[model samples]
Target: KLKIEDFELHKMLGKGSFGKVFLAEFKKTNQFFAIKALKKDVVLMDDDVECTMVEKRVLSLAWEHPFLTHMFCTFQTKENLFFVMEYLNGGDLMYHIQSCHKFDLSRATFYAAEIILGLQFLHSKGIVYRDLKLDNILLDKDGHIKIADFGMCKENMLGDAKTNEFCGTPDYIAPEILLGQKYNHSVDWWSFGVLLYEMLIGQSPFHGQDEEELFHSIRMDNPFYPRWLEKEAKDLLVKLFVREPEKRLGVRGDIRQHPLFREINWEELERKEIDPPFRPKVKSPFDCSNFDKEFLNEKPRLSFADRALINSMDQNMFRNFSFMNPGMERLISHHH
Candidate 1:
């Protein structure tokens, strides 16, 4: 974990069920970061007490990766737990796809290539990204992708070890997850396949009148393939969408050279030398235009932490929660 002593909160960035995001700056480097201040009591009351700790460890592991969110360090107080992470000003992939237009084949290919790298990196690190969707993919100022939202992840899943958590976004959930079966990192590939279909076609492959029908479709039905999809694209999608894990495109090995990505050079793509098809219109480093105004309207505060709840809970529930990632020890607390 990296070390930081102080920081200044400048703005209310956003809010989640667990916490609120704040625009902050570290004192020593004068660099900006988005800090997630989670209410301690809210975390403490959850059944999986390690979720917070797991999130810290997960984000810390991601600091070194280019396609993942860089969480520099985490700090804590009695009332709140803080994650000081890098801020992306280019908005999320969902925003771009929804507000503008669906990406063409070339653009989708570029974006999917980056996402594949990110998924591979996470798998290499023994983490399974249970949630992979447009809303969870963010773009940096230069239009590069960063996979975010680690809350749904399952870690320490190296080798043949499997997990049974029914965690995933419904739109992208693996069929195995819905079946309540033990699954491996291959689940992420299924989610990625869904994203690939969405990126190329601008909508989900399978649809149903109800969510039950939706899950059933995911489990039993074949998605419609449009005539416009190239033969290579259709073949890749069919292979990825296979119901049996043993027969899935990536179950036995990585899908590194599937024809859809034949034009993509693995080495060059990882290094990010190829130009992105689209770039977000960012005005400056400090520009906050990408963030939604609804969140910006809310006041950033730490007042909701109930004193009685804080006093009543066993504080040891969050023991060793404070952590600093290695190689980032140079930073210090920021000046407000």
Candidate 2:
């Protein structure tokens, strides 16, 4: 029964290939939401629909975690599909990193632990998140972690789970993925190791003049650590970035028990007891206002192939895509 008028779209936050996200105020609740508004035509496309399914599944399964982004609900109108989600006012970790350049070890340690907790949750659920770059992790108003963009997630059981599908952002992709082998959840751990290194060092360990060279380097080279990283931190990174998936820190039970987290008090970490050693000095939610015009005001364009795919898709596949559920049930009652 929600209409366009039910929420006031205040300003654009961020957008992507299929939809635009806006800071919307729900009239009834007087609460703010980051509404992902997708054109129905666009949502019906091949990968677009599949991505939507991934997002829906991941959000639904991952909602129990305090660090995960909240998906309030999803609905559809005649022309658009809307996902009402918790508004993370802190923006993406990538934006913060780009602004500040680097973070101190303490901040990196906290974030690493939080991300590992998230990965643990995902692994326990049998979901393999192929993407783990900084751009996909957000912070809440209170500076808690929030994992976003589950569009590349896949389900895995046991054994040597591998897929040759080249997905994920280049910087965080595992060497195994670049080798074009079928891999499983271990790929996520590899990306996690890369992200940890990048967060502490301010850039990825592997880079080259072109995509091919970057892929080659990732598969063949050993990542070098700067002298600034402490011995303990470096040891943790070595374990995480081990070439053998079996040797990765994620698969090892002793990871959290490592000396790197020796000073970390579990109860304190959970209660936000420790002050984040590195603070970006972001003043408030309003401090993010300038980013609106920069990333949100651009005109949207869909590729020709995407448009064609959208036109050919079946509508009934999106049972969970509609906002008219309650209203439709009411109508059916009256008719009967």
Candidate 3:
């Protein structure tokens, strides 16, 4: 049983409406982890407690997959909920994209291929990754991708089971979601197509001045591909960006057959045998160079008094919140 004192919180990694993520190191084992601490008051105020619980549940179910971030455990303090996950020092894909502008075809193809596998695995597990963007795709020490942030994920959905929630980033959102149509896992494929375009071109296919214009473009406008793009890559994007969910590529296994991925061995890709095109310059397990300096320098905001009041009023609200998967513990044991 681990306590909050068991780990040393090092630096702030990022901040969100709910709370902040920090770089943490376990005192006894000296293993590095990323801890996301969500303020209970903020969660209650935003009426997003269910989202937090859903994220925890989804992470637990998806942790077995290699392409997904590993959740070691979850524990709650009086004021916040903490999710302890594997810390990838290589930074996120968005950071790299911003630094390098656009990726070459081969590099983009490699990332797209890995993401395809990750989405395939998630869908197979009856999970819909509502969010798919460069920011959510993190890189490891070896530059392999790990999909993170499951707060928007929907789970326990069977084949073609449609959800009507209007969620996901505006640029990557599918037309069906914008139209208020019931959508299935195919929405993820649509976002995947948008991400592919962004990776290849260093910008979104549909870039508008505002949210309304972005949604309008996603609904009415067709994506424009550069003349330099390969025909196969263009075709794959076209198939994936289809307005109708039923016609989407990945939803029907057409992504695997697409010429863009013809040379990829799915099995070998799963094993990470195909070398990544870019490797992050990480000198140690605790390197923060790849992360944003702005975030690392910011001080964490801890609402100590607010937390005490909330806990005193509703102690049972967080009962049974603390959890540690024995399987994950064993894996971490072997990892160290």
- TM-score per candidate, in order? 0.91, 0.85, 0.93
The TM-score leader among the candidates is 3
Could you give candidate 2's per-residue lDDT for residues 71-147 as a string of tens digits?
87777655566777877876678887886788678888888887777887888888888989888888776566788
Off by over 4 Å in 1: 1-5, 27-30, 46-48, 325-328, 333-336
**Segments of candidate 2 deviating more than 4 angstroms:** 43-46, 156-164, 271-293, 296-312, 322-336
Q: After superposition, how far is residue 161 of candidate 1 from its true place, in Å?
A: 1.3
Please count the clashing residue pairs in each candidate, in the order shown. Answer: 11, 8, 0
RMSD of 3: 2.6
Candidate 2 lDDT at 97 equals 82
TM-score of 2: 0.85
Q: On residues 196-273, what C-alpha lDDT tens digit does candidate 1 reach at each position?
A: 888878899777788898888899888788999878777878888987777788676558888788998988988878
RMSD of each: 2.7, 4.7, 2.6
Candidate 3 overall lDDT versus native: 0.84
Which candidate should be chosen as best, given lDDT against the real structure? 3
Q: Per-residue CA lDDT of candidate 3, range 43-89, in tens? A: 77677777887888888777778788998899887677899988998
| Alpha-carbon shift of residue 292 in model 3 (angstroms) | 0.6
